[PDB]
Amino acid sequence: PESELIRQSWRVVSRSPLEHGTVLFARLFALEPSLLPLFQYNGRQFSSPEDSLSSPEFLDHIRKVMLVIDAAVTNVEDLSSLEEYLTSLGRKHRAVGVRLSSASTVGESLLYMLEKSLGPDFTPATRTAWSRLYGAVVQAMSRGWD
Ligand code: HEM
């Protein structure tokens, strides 16, 4: 039932994944500015959050994030099926220097972007559904922090 709530809500945002993911990342850096230096491209550090939004590579990474979320939505009823992919994704992020602790801020940023996009439509069952999906995704990724 909640899996339908996820599919329904994702529909709207999935249509413009970069615009929506841009909200997610803007929120993320507003909450935890210390994540900005972890995006090292061309050996350089972004000075300010707005610098990231001018970077092709950074915007590409937004698209990657939204693609993975889309995969979880696709498999919302399965999700044993992404276990291995997510475990390795966690390993990768550990390697680029993301702390597992920062996953919750990412979660809050996702939930923020959904709330702002859905407005009246982001009902508390909708929040709860997404909290439990995202939490599941993070459980899988956390295996990669070994
Ligand atoms: C604090 C949050 C995050 C940071 C700092 C971060 C940073 C990075 C960095 C630096 C890379 C490698 C450079 C690049 O490909 O652009 C990367 C790759 C990637 N990220 Fe993230 N990321 C974050 C969250 C996420 C989330 C939540 C997802 C998906 C749910 C995601 C999906 C990806 C994917 C698919 C790749 C390509 C990885 C590979 O196979 O090599 N990221 N991320």
Residue numbers in the entry: 4 to 149
Give verbatim excerpts from the published study on this entry.
Ngb is over-expressed in hypoxic conditions and it may be involved in gas/redox sensing, radical scavenging, and/or signal transduction. Notably, hexacoordination in Ngb accounts for a peculiar structural rearrangement and complex kinetics upon ligand binding, which takes place when the distal histidine (His(E7)64), engaged in internal iron hexacoordination, dissociates from the heme. The dissociation of His64 is the rate-limiting step for ligand binding and it triggers a repositioning of the heme which slides further inside a large internal cavity. In this study, we spectroscopically and structurally characterized three Ngb mutants aiming at pinpointing key features: a CD loop mutant with enhanced flexibility (Gly-loop), the F106A mutant and the double Gly-loop/F106A mutant.
Crystal structures of unliganded hexacoordinated F106A (1.8 Å) and carbomonoxy-F106A (F106A-CO, 1.75 Å), were determined to observe the effect of removal of the steric barrier to heme sliding posed by Phe106. At this resolution, we clearly detect the double heme conformation: the B conformer (canonical, 30% in ferric F106A, 27% in F106A-CO) and the A one (reversed, 70% in ferric F106A, 73% in F106A-CO). As compared to WT Ngb, the structural difference between the two conformers is larger, likely due to the wider heme cavity, created by the Phe to Ala substitution that allows conformer B to adopt a deeper position within the pocket. We also observed double conformations for proximal and distal histidines. The geometry of the His64-Fe-His96 bond, for both conformers, appears to be different with respect to WT Ngb and it might contribute to reactivity with ligands. However, the most striking observation about heme conformations is the relative position of the A and B conformers, that are laterally and vertically shifted, with their iron atoms being about 1.0 Å and 0.90 Å apart, respectively in the unliganded and in the carbomonoxy form. Consistently, Phe(CD1)42, a conserved residue involved in the heme packing through π-π stacking interactions, adopts a double conformation in a 70:30 proportion (lateral displacement of 1.0 Å at the level of Phe42 Cζ, not shown) in the structure of unliganded F106A. The effect of the double heme insertion observed in Ngb is enhanced by the increased size of the large Ngb internal cavity created by the F106A mutation, which results in a set of alternate conformations of proximal side residues that account for the enhanced biphasic behaviour in ligand binding of mutants carrying this substitution.
